[PDB]
Amino acid sequence: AALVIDNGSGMCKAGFAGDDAPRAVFPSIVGRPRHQGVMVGMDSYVGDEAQSKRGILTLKYPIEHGIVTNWDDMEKIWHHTFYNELRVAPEEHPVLLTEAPLNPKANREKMTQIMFETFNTPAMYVAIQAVLSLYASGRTTGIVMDSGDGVTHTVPIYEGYALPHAILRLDLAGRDLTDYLMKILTERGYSFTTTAEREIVRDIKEKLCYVALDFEQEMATAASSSSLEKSYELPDGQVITIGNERFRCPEALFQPSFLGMESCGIHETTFNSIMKCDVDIRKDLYANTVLSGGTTMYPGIADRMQKEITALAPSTMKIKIIAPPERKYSVWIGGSILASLSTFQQMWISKQEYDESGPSIVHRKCF
Amino acid sequence: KIELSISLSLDSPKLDESDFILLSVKYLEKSLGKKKEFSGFFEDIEKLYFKQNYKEAIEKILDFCKKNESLLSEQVVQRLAEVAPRLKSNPKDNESRRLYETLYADHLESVIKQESDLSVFNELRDSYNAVKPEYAVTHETEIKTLDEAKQFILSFVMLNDNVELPLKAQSERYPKKDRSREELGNTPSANPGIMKPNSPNFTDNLVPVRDVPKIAINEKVAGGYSKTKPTTPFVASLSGTTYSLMVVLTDYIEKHKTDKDIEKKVNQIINLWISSYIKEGYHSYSEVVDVLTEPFLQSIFDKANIKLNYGVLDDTHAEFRKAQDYVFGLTIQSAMHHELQERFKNK
Amino acid sequence: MQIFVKTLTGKTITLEVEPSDTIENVKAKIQDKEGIPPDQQRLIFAGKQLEDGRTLSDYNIQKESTLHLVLRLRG
Ligand SMILES: Nc1ncnc2c1ncn2[C@@H]1O[C@H](COP(=O)(O)OP(=O)(O)NP(=O)(O)O)[C@@H](O)[C@H]1O
Secondary structure, X not given: OOEEEEEXXXXXXXXXXXXXXXXXXXXXXXXXXOOOOOOOOXXXXXXXXXXXXXXXXXXXXXXXXXXXXXHHHHHHHHHHHHHHHXXXXXXXXXXXXXXXXXXXXXXXXXXXXXXXXXXXXXXXXXXXXXXXXXXXXXXXXXXXXXEOOOOEEEEEEEOOEEOOOOOXXXXXXXXXXXXXXXXXXXXXXXXXXXXXXXXXXXXXXHHHOOOOOOHHHHHHHHOOOOOOOEEEEOXXXXXXXXOOHHHHOHHHHOOHHHHOOOOOOHHHHHHHHHXXXXXXXXXXXXXXXXXXXXXXXXXXXXXXXXXXHHHHOOOOOOOOEEOOOOHHHHXXXXXXXXXXXXXXXXXOEEHHHHHHHOHHHHHHHOO | OHHHHHHHHHOOOOOOHHHHHHHHHHHHHHHOOOOHHHHHHHHHHHHHHHOOOHHHHHHHHHHHHHOOHHHOOHHHHHHHHHHHHHOOOOOOOOHHHHHHHHHHHHHHHHHHHHHOOOHHHHHHHXXXXXXXXXXXXXXXXXXXXXXXXXXXHHHHHHHOOOXXXXXXXXXXXXXXXXXXXXXXXXXXXXXXXXXOOOOOOOOOOOOOOEEEEOOOEOOOOOOOHHHHOOOXXXXXXXXXXXXXXXXXXXXXXXXXXXXXXXXXXXXXXXHHHHHHHHHOOOOOHHHHHHHHOOHHHHHHHHOOOOOOOOOOOOOOHHHHHXXXXXXXXXXXXXXXXXXXXXXXXXX | OEEEEEEOOOOEEEEEOXXXXXXXXXXXXXXXXXXXXXXXXXXXXXXXXXXXXXEOHHHOOOOOOEEXXXXXXXX
């Protein structure tokens, strides 16, 4: 049975192909001790335990902006994935890894090198996250809107191939949305500044926030009735109430000025993306905008994307926003789907093929 | 494994004549290994493939496949021979050949880089300074590096639609050009050479993103080149600029006729020209070579005792191998996509 | 300001222009004066083919500068 690990900017999603959810979802962060001597009597901590010991540890996000940057910490994440979470020996399972769009050549070779020479897998493959997300929705052509923890990508894909010339990247996603939520709830009176309070504000975000269909009437409705307010109960029992904060926060995705960013907005980058593609394929793209990842999970986001792209596109363009219900983990699910196809058994990179040509083989097999 | 892979690979709907040739040979290089005995069939197929001689080479492949039937899979030769009579080529869509020719342009350029002492291009400065129109700048720098000659050779386009019109007009091939006039603008691309902006590509074979021309075929041209030679990929049709190169070369040959190494040195130009025109995406191989080989241009060389090799190389093995992998990847992905979408229907 | 566009026959078309004017503009002015469709026009100055988006300033074309004009031959 083949493994599927989504190497995410803030969460690693790992599991077994054939299942339709990852078994393990844990913070993709490595912690080492802050002062020696918390070490006397035992080395390093990964994942859920390293957030529990944040105060005796110096956290590092080895994959903060979607591209893995620290290979010693990635080695340890993957080791924790295989041996603690899934509880398997990697020599015993072909392994499908995901990569970010526009992933350097060498980052791909180094992924392959580690998987064969450090975990001694029989087989492996590397697919682009967005492509997997498109596959899980039964398309092989569209534009995927991938918004995770540390990075968002708008990724046009034509007959399975992500187009390097038109992929747009954008360093605003959930981590930034969670901090803004912190900021504005503080301005309201409720103090959230500690790393422990940051954790509750992430819960408040994923449970109560939503996208306004138009920002202004929602503000007007907030300013003129109680209907939008929602009570939220903290861990120590205190109850607080969230008002326009509920939608002011995810609004940051269409108005990065809210955070000081002079960027465009997930709708403008989507259009900009589509317009670096050949005219002949834009109609297909516009009719297959696929939303994907944890940060597209806000109620109302499909409908506003519909509205805003309709405002940017030519007046006859047929426009579809596809936002699956499973899109929190649709990268991984497309991975699970792919690994399971029988025809995919002819496409693994084999242990044999690897020491015949070394890590550069990834370029000739995975594209 | 390999028997079932080529099986899947052959199921593809979009499989073209050049895809089949590469897919076939990959099978026989794995099945019959490097037994020397067939070493020359492999060598001959690659040489016929370069010369775009798909008919002869597909003929040679089935027939080799009959006369070695017990050595192979009867399942695989049946699909090979059943699929062959229905194989076409599509100049809009010749992706395996685009990637081959583009890798070949690099092999050719590097062969010239260790062959040429760059004296021919320094000698050629004078033939250009003589036949250039008045609005074209003279070249007065010395050509020290091969890029410096690459940019020089390319600047002959300055002669176009003026100096080369006398001998353009003696062609009967060139009126059957079929580049559409409709100006289409520029599309961004990260593939090199003659590849399509949208086609898959090995992720070590990318090039930095920049704009390139979209050009269309007229398709309503009677006897048009795209129609008569569908094996060659369309980039911009027949290369008119190469009459401009022939006006410069005619002058060069005239005033170096007694040169003993004249044949050596004219092939360095003709070939560097060919490599650069593919590498820069102006034209595919045949779009250049098929205006060069027309018999009224061939006189010019024959009467001066010059035999052109046309950039035909000793071996193309690396670039041929690389192309096999490419069509292998693409056609198994095709298979995988078909399994994928027929699993969603059933949900 | 004034410039001069010279054709292969050595006849010369003189044109009143603003240094802000693009090449799309000068080619259109030539069409209006002589009939030549601009997709056929190739303007040459200082040995370079002139590109449409750029302006005369961007090419340092002062007053009385001479352009050269070559017409494309196609089908
Ligand atoms: N309403 C919500 N429901 C569930 N998750 C949410 C919601 N809103 C935000 N999330 C955020 O969505 C992010 C989840 O990130 P995720 O999609 O796994 O990104 P990743 O780690 O970058 N992997 P990937 O998307 O494949 O690149 C977290 O910041 C979550 O807090």
